[PDB]
Amino acid sequence: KWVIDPSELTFVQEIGSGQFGLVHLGYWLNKDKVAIKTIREGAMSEEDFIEEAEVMMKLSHPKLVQLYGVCLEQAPICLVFEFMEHGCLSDYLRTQRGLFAAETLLGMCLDVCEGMAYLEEACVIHRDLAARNCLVGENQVIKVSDFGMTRFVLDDQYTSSTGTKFPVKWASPEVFSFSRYSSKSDVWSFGVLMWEVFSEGKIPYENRSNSEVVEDISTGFRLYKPRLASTHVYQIMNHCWRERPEDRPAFSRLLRQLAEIAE
Ligand SMILES: Nc1ncnc2c1ncn2[C@@H]1O[C@H](COP(=O)(O)OP(=O)(O)O)[C@@H](O)[C@H]1O
Numbered sequence: 001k002w003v004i005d006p007s008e009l010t011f012v013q014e015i016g017s018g019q020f021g022l023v024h025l026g027y028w029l030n031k032d033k034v035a036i037k038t039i040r041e042g043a044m045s046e047e048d049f050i051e052e053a054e055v056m057m058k059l060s061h062p063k064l065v066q067l068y069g070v071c072l073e074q075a076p077i078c079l080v081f082e083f084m085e086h087g088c089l090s091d092y093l094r095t096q097r098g099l100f101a102a103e104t105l106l107g108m109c110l111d112v113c114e115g116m117a118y119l120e121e122a123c124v125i126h127r128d129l130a131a132r133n134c135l136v137g138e139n140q141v142i143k144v145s146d147f148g149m150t151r152f153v154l155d156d157q158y159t160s161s162t163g164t165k166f167p168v169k170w171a172s173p174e175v176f177s178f179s180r181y182s183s184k185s186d187v188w189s190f191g192v193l194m195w196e197v198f199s200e201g202k203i204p205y206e207n208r209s210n211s212e213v214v215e216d217i218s219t220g221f222r223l224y225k226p227r228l229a230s231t232h233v234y235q236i237m238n239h240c241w242r243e244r245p246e247d248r249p250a251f252s253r254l255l256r257q258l259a260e261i262a263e
């Protein structure tokens, strides 16, 4: 089962604060060390989430952070995840800026691409892929996390394309216009993630408001090439940012293309 009883969890240390609550390092009885995220009441549709648990627990891949289960005996509920020692990728890049070899940055993109190729085959859409949603583990492995979570977030300012906190910077035109999510909209987001990785954690379109990003993208403007990205890597980024979803590569194609470049 995916239900974890409160007696099977022990909170050891606070890791940090998230959008919807605290994150602790803890232990899960007879299992492993875990990261536990406490979810503020009202932040997510808990009943909708619990309905998909039996199906979603079957997803397992080396490049996806495992969500082991939920502790829901009383509010606030807890989500129990695999512990990722080095934390989020966006912070990891920013803190180690200037210490990365270009091969390591391409390797991080390849780990994410592998995890995303598994979700694409599984017909699971992430909806908010970004470096902030990737985590860094043992020996600097990158794993994707939080796929599908925006379908349960109750704050309309984040989930509505016309909302003030919407992640427009990682959104394809059909997502920011119509909320038309697909694995091809995740490919657009993946191109922005590659830009974040090769820029060592810079924020995309930092000099633009959300409406300015929409106008810029719609008139054909794209993110500039980071210094560390080769012209071949930047070409693949641009393929992710094609206006028509049908013209973007699938993750299965990107994985082969990026691997050929790396190997
Ligand atoms: N699985 C995990 N393992 C280790 N640290 C984690 C894990 N999930 C989240 N964290 C850490 O918890 C903090 C907040 O996490 P996150 O829940 O992603 O907040 P937010 O959703 O606002 O980004 C960050 O410092 C992040 O590195």
Ligand SMILES: CC(C)Oc1ccc2cccc(-n3cc(NC(N)=O)c(C(N)=O)n3)c2c1
Residues within 6 Å of the ligand: 002, 049, 050, 052, 053, 054, 056, 057, 058, 059, 060, 064, 065, 066, 067, 068, 069, 070, 081, 144, 145, 146, 147, 148, 149
């Ligand atoms: C206990 C888990 C399996 O329950 C759910 C229920 C609904 C879900 C809906 C969307 C996505 C889910 N989801 C998210 C996951 N992992 C991370 N790191 O976010 C996993 C997994 N199997 O590792 N499943 C869900 C996971």
